[PDB]
Design a protein around this ligand. Structure first.
Ligand code: GTP
Ligand code: GTP
Ligand code: GTP
Ligand code: GTP
Ligand code: GTP
Ligand code: GTP
Lengths: 231, 233, 237, 236, 237, 233
């Protein structure tokens, strides 16, 4: 089997790592995800991963209590590094070479993000996990995925979601769209600022379903899974 | 009254900020804690706080799955910074001046720990929250509390726990009122991690174990009044 | 009068500091700008400034030659710090207290950005210059201005431009072009008006950060924008 | 032929990258410089480059207006990093492996200078570009080239200039002639303008050979390396 | 023979590098030590070294004069980096690949400690010297050796000392004195034996990190400790 | 009296802190030096100090053994920070406000050098100790003193030496009283490293060479009185 992508940026939601309790990190659901990535690696795909922090930091309640927006996003930012930290470990236990990089330098914990060092690592069959989003508050994990995606010169961003693509009860799942077509039809693919970044840099986005078994493997094979977004 | 301590290091367990769900940060339980600290500040006490990360990172399950011990502690270390981040915010919302410092520099998020800058801040009626423990793995939050306690030249470390001192599971027990470092090792009592305890002992840093859940217990511990156990020599 | 803003984020284009030669930094055009800011400070306004790097780095030619986009923006990012560096100096020579902060820490050159430290400095009658944009490539100086603006809790972002606000059409080329006085984020997207980069605009919209586009070349226009008087366009909702 | 140098430190003036407009970076003048370096690399030479910032920051006018000297030099320092940034990119587009290092750490932009990491990189056929001078103000780009040159244990510093070596008299004074070799003592004695005195002292005290040559003279660089007689050499 | 250890953490006292004058660094005593390590490297052992700073900073006199304890330990911390700096150099002169890492980042001098980068380097036949202890004051070099030892996943910590192991009672002031050969963490606390600082010891115990106390002065003792042969005391459980 | 200098950069040799044993740091010789500086502070002088590392690192022997020159200078660089560390402490024990800055950032130990932050500190009656020289190898402590001197806009660099100024080991020798940069190069006099000297010359930074051992000599150099040699133009 051959893949239509040599280098991808896989974007996970923090919740993707949640267990039944609807929070934290579930070891098995995580090792499962490590294996899915091990496949992509073995198919010769260079994999950058960007994780969110929703499973470790909600903070909707703290926002309600009046918590400063910036401080809130800094907490989420750290949350994403815990997830990345866990994922890098999960991969090493799956005998996959992996590095964790952080937008916010964390001395002794993981190396600081460098677009160049990331490319170098990906070219050496290292999975590169990219943490702490953009380094700034008020930017979604999507924004970070696209920014990183563009920097590391990925062929595509794979937004792993709970839904099986972009949908028009009835109607139908789109199969392909354009950046213009998505704005025009007012479809919810991702945060508008993140979307603009991908559009302006002609970075293809594939929305798919991480829960649909082997869906990831298929998205890479080029096969029709979820929606693709290009132009 | 008059506080018998001009500078204390209050050590909280991460769980201290947990809600009913037994995880995360509960806004009300947190703002409550900010208020308790606002009191100590208003009494003219200089307050350093050291928080753990247990409420945000358990990772006993990940350890079970074979997660590297170092990576595990690094996750907890970050966890403690989220708690500190939350607490600093909670205090500013209670109109208390507060700084967050981290053993691991976090550019743009909070300033890097400096024993000197910490003292300077405490002397300016800033509550100083100390995050990311010692900066190293394999050191308990207790160890960090003592280390920081000694560095900032605190008069005492207040270990806030769920129990009312050193002794509701056996009808045959009695709360100590004061002990010595030697007396605690000898009687094999569980005050805190042994490495942490040694650090306090060797630097003659008094430890007060008390009950954060017992209302006003904190206020009392400071007044000098008899609350929980004291440990000196 | 009385300024309707206690804290503003003034966003300058790098070119704003250009001389006649259309590049670099012109000492007099810079000292003038320092004076304009000295006024706002004296009126008791807390001033954050965000500068671009267009006057020091073009690099359209290098992009044409195939230069990597990231590297290009990093060069621009450094460019903005040179401008900030020059501006902080110009202000100290105008006896205005000023700090330079950078999104990319520059040991010994200026302090690293911290939203908190920025607020603290503004509250102490320091002009805070914010350099190196967002710290990332592919983000405009506008994006940086809004992001910083929201972080330091500014009341408004003042986009200083060469035009006197937002026009129904273009003024410099069309005699039917007239000037809006106020718009809404929705109204700007709907009427497809060019206020600023879309990503930057979304940031301001989602955080209800008012934007005032005005003309830095129109003498005293800055002073007026602050007085609340009608200068250029305002954008709120 | 065979290069008489295994490791050199090439020192460029920022202006070396200027276009016709007398400022900025000209893509073509830069890509040709990348190609000149690609040659040295494929001759098996280890190349460290030190660039100035004159093309991106003049600031004589701002000095005149009273700008603080330190701030001025910090601006130039950043300027050199922009040049280095451009040069590293130019080399990668010429399929030459290259790293940018900065005396002032720049998180995420390029790695921090380390004399040791520099040598390691040079030994792996990486061109190592060294930016932000010495990290300090009041030190010329020449000073940085010598300092770096000594640190990375280069065999020679190649000061690329607009003139074809050191002349008995001012070239652009029709009665001038070109030296072929001098000594540090001979240069101070004859009061010749090779480079800033502080920089020169550094090279002298560490017996670091300096070759002044003409970057505009085609293939002059290739020749300086071959050992052939181009511009002036300075040793002892 | 065959080394019973694939990765060790060798802990030296700063004094280990002292000359006759009882201070500083003696080139020959250092090059000697570099050679001992070159052996371990050639036997295929991955070697992490942790050095103290006692030879370069005493400061008992400054403590006496009232010097702040923290400041004192920071001076010692820097001291250890000077030793590590010297040792890395000594090894390169012995044609041994070696990296210096510091708990306190030292831009341009050596790279910052990273448990992961340390392991990577050891796996590439680099000797990894670990400096500045734990990065904190009030922690002994022993504590640093154990912490590092655990982090880099060493099989054993080799505490090189002036004595030939752990003794029941002093061997030169008692004829019935028999140097232990093996102990347990519990056995050492129980018998109240001085192996190392209590905090450091607890760290090794809780992580089941074997400790071998031996004599660096006894020629070839190091080589033997590694061979598995019975030199000095071992401490496990 | 009235000091003819509002801001000075005092350059000490590391050896200046040596005891009888000819190495290390002698507590009393150090506290003595702290007091001399306390005076200058009390006279309203802003004091920047630059210390060398000779007392803590010789390394002529290690150079002889083939040690890399860079590594050697890095060791000395660290040495200077130990001295500065000791001096900052000595000053706080003499109730003098003092900050330590390093050309090489040392997280948690002391703050990173910033020419601006240095000036700010000096203007707030802080003695500012400047460590790790220029941050680079192959630069003398003199070079660092001048560079720092120029950056912090000092009026003068006071090179404290063992000799009482610049002299014409001789029966026939007279102490100069004032020279010029040109006059010093011309007469081939040993004031300081040539690179360092050039820096001071090109920036018209006055240098006063004097004798730290001559009691009250420092106090006098500041009063404007004739002590050791002055070098200007
Ligand atoms: N169990 C575990 N080991 C780790 C982890 N991170 C680093 N290591 C160990 O440290 C070694 C070096 O890790 P890296 O920083 O990734 O360096 P590397 O040479 O690129 O090794 P790989 O990236 O794993 O291929 C790894 O091979 C592991 O032995 C982790 O997250 N979990
Ligand atoms: N809501 C909120 N605001 C913060 C927080 N941290 C900093 N700030 C804001 O940023 C300003 C600067 O904060 P600091 O860096 O702590 O400096 P400061 O002058 O000591 O401010 P205080 O600690 O309140 O005295 C504060 O006055 C607040 O307005 C936080 O955690 N939550
Ligand atoms: N000429 C000039 N001097 C500067 C500049 N930056 C700092 N300084 C010097 O540094 C002193 C204070 O440094 P700052 O970084 O501004 O810190 P500060 O404590 O806020 O001092 P001020 O902002 O000037 O009130 C000033 O008095 C200047 O002498 C600059 O950009 N240009
Ligand atoms: N276009 C461009 N690409 C760069 C630049 N710097 C790094 N890269 C890319 O990032 C990858 C990693 O390069 P580096 O991290 O700088 O170092 P490296 O391991 O020596 O990689 P190479 O130099 O390409 O062999 C390179 O292969 C380039 O594709 C640059 O300045 N311009
Ligand atoms: N004399 C001396 N040279 C050094 C020292 N450290 C680094 N170097 C030089 O810098 C080169 C690179 O050393 P490293 O930074 O350790 O990189 P490396 O690839 O691990 O090189 P090795 O350690 O020799 O394997 C060495 O080959 C030496 O030439 C040192 O401490 N002393
Ligand atoms: N013993 C000792 N204490 C120090 C030293 N440095 C800082 N401290 C303590 O930490 C406090 C803060 O020091 P700084 O960082 O210099 O802050 P500061 O506001 O400038 O305070 P001072 O300089 O001491 O007036 C001091 O008041 C001392 O009590 C030192 O070198 N030795």
């Amino acid at each position: 089997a051959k893949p239509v992508y040599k280098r991808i940026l896989l974007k996970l939601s923090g919740e993707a790592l949640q267990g039944t309790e609807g929070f934290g990190i579930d070891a098995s659901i995580l090792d499962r995800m490590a294996q899915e990535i091990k496949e992509l690696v073995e198919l010769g795909i260079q994999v950058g991963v960007v994780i969110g922090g929703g499973n470790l930091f909600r903070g909707a309640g703290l926002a309600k209590a009046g918590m400063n927006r910036v401080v809130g996003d800094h907490m989420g930012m750290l949350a994403t590094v815990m997830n990345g930290l866990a994922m890098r470990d999960a991969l090493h236990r799956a005998y996959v070479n992996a590095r964790l990089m952080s937008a916010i330098p964390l001395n002794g914990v993981c190396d600081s993000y460098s677009w160049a060092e990331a490319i170098s690592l990906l070219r050496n069959n290292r999975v590169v996990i990219l943490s702490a989003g953009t380094g700034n508050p008020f930017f979604t994990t999507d924004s970070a995925a696209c920014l990183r995606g563009i920097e590391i010169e990925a062929n595509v961003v794979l937004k792993a979601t709970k839904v099986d693509g972009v949908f028009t009860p009835t109607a139908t799942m789109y199969e392909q769209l354009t950046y213009s077509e998505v704005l025009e039809k007012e479809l919810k693919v991702m945060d508008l600022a993140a979307f603009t970044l991908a559009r302006d840099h002609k970075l293809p986005i594939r929305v798919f379903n991480m829960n649909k078994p082997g869906a990831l493997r298929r998205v890479v094979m080029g096969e029709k899974e979820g929606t693709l977004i290009t132009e």
